[PDB]
Tab-separated table of C-alpha atoms in Angstrom:
chain	number	residue	atom	x	y	z
A	1	UNK	CA	-39.416	-12.166	36.144
A	2	UNK	CA	-36.419	-12.891	38.467
A	3	UNK	CA	-37.264	-13.319	42.368
A	4	UNK	CA	-35.229	-13.935	45.540
A	5	UNK	CA	-35.219	-17.618	46.433
A	6	UNK	CA	-33.225	-17.897	49.501
A	7	UNK	CA	-34.451	-18.983	52.925
A	8	UNK	CA	-34.551	-16.583	55.813
A	9	UNK	CA	-31.413	-14.570	56.447
A	10	UNK	CA	-29.034	-16.833	54.385
A	11	UNK	CA	-27.001	-15.213	51.596
A	12	UNK	CA	-29.320	-13.866	48.806
A	13	UNK	CA	-30.090	-16.258	45.717
A	14	UNK	CA	-32.162	-15.405	42.952
A	15	UNK	CA	-34.353	-17.480	40.414
A	16	UNK	CA	-35.443	-16.755	36.942
A	17	UNK	CA	-39.052	-17.620	36.700
A	18	UNK	CA	-41.055	-19.433	34.024
A	19	UNK	CA	-42.052	-17.201	31.164
A	20	UNK	CA	-45.279	-15.329	31.785
A	21	UNK	CA	-44.906	-15.829	35.667
A	22	UNK	CA	-45.219	-12.353	37.018
A	23	UNK	CA	-45.105	-12.969	40.738
A	24	UNK	CA	-42.892	-13.426	43.578
A	25	UNK	CA	-43.542	-14.705	47.159
A	26	UNK	CA	-42.616	-14.567	50.624
A	27	UNK	CA	-43.932	-17.189	52.968
A	28	UNK	CA	-43.339	-17.284	56.713
A	29	UNK	CA	-44.328	-19.680	59.375
A	30	UNK	CA	-43.007	-21.165	62.656
A	31	UNK	CA	-42.268	-24.703	63.265
A	32	UNK	CA	-40.712	-26.680	66.234
A	33	UNK	CA	-37.169	-25.486	64.888
A	34	UNK	CA	-37.764	-21.832	64.548
A	35	UNK	CA	-39.120	-19.104	62.261
A	36	UNK	CA	-38.862	-19.766	58.673
A	37	UNK	CA	-39.118	-17.497	55.507
A	38	UNK	CA	-39.261	-19.147	52.324
A	39	UNK	CA	-38.999	-17.169	48.965
A	40	UNK	CA	-39.746	-18.068	45.253
A	41	UNK	CA	-41.448	-17.563	42.098
A	42	UNK	CA	-45.182	-17.235	41.797
A	43	UNK	CA	-47.919	-16.713	44.162
A	44	UNK	CA	-48.959	-20.034	45.781
A	45	UNK	CA	-52.446	-20.648	47.352
A	46	UNK	CA	-52.966	-19.610	51.076
A	47	UNK	CA	-52.510	-22.465	53.498
A	48	UNK	CA	-53.676	-22.109	56.938
A	49	UNK	CA	-51.435	-20.732	59.464
A	50	UNK	CA	-48.946	-19.614	56.934
A	51	UNK	CA	-48.147	-15.976	56.250
A	52	UNK	CA	-47.979	-15.165	52.527
A	53	UNK	CA	-47.237	-12.013	50.571
A	54	UNK	CA	-47.057	-11.926	46.870
A	55	UNK	CA	-45.471	-9.009	44.874
A	56	UNK	CA	-45.360	-8.390	41.086
A	57	UNK	CA	-42.078	-6.702	40.433
A	58	UNK	CA	-38.341	-7.584	39.860
A	59	UNK	CA	-36.748	-9.098	42.974
A	60	UNK	CA	-39.741	-7.716	45.092
A	61	UNK	CA	-39.697	-10.531	47.793
A	62	UNK	CA	-36.898	-9.741	49.997
């Protein structure tokens, strides 16, 4: 699996996940500086106040 791993609206970058990892994620939250969108491999656990979206297809997390 290959997932996007760039932050927000910055230029696209991708990452090849560990073998057997089938998910990608999109996490979004706000902080004192602005709105952040983090992307990566896997499907992390839900943390309060953070929006999370997981998908299981190639570069599915834009």
